[PDB]
Design a protein around this ligand. Sequence first.
Ligand SMILES: [Zn+2]
Length: 257
Amino acid sequence: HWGYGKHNGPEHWHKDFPIAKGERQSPVDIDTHTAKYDPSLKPLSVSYDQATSLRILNNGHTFNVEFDDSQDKAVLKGGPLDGTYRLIQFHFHWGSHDGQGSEHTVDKKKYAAELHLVHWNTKYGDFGKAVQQPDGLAVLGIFLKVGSANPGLQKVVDVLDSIKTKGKSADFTNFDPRGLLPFSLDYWTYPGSLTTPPLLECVTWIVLKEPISVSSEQVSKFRKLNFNGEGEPEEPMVDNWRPTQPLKNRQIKASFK
Ligand SMILES: [Zn+2]
């Protein structure tokens, strides 16, 4: 019912999801000169040592790596957050070519891809309750810059040929998401939304300044996925990104001076 095509794409999402034109929509452009250091931010704590990946799936929009979120096995704390946020899945957005694909931009520059690690606030008990609250979700956003091959991505790349069409999934256990993090956790933060329908304004965005690498060959494997289901005309899964939205009455804060 929604997608990234001419008919069903970001320019038309507002018809069925009028919040698409709301106060706190994502992604946004990050102006690095006007994002101000915020000394009230606490240190950011990523605790992924016990993370338990389960499956990888093509949902017709991207591919998701799903985690066991029945316990505090992989959590995000600190920074702008109050309380504990549990990892439920991560996924990517990417382009048709290396010069586009990210959702957030930095001084109007696009990266080749962007990684989203989605976490929900445990005080709401269940992801489905959390997404209804303004402090329900915390999404780590990590930019991918084409350069050297990334070993922490390779297990993902290697399984993508098994989930080429919408609705396919594969077993995906023992994947360590720490291998997808940059070495510095310096970040920008702002209040926003899911970047796909239903576009709910429940997200504390934490966008890391340091990108991770991806080889040309690795991102080319992302582009061999398809939006369509089996037996339908082929629609390559590329350019599954929403363009940036107006900042409106928000500020982007920096964790670093
Ligand atoms: Zn995303």
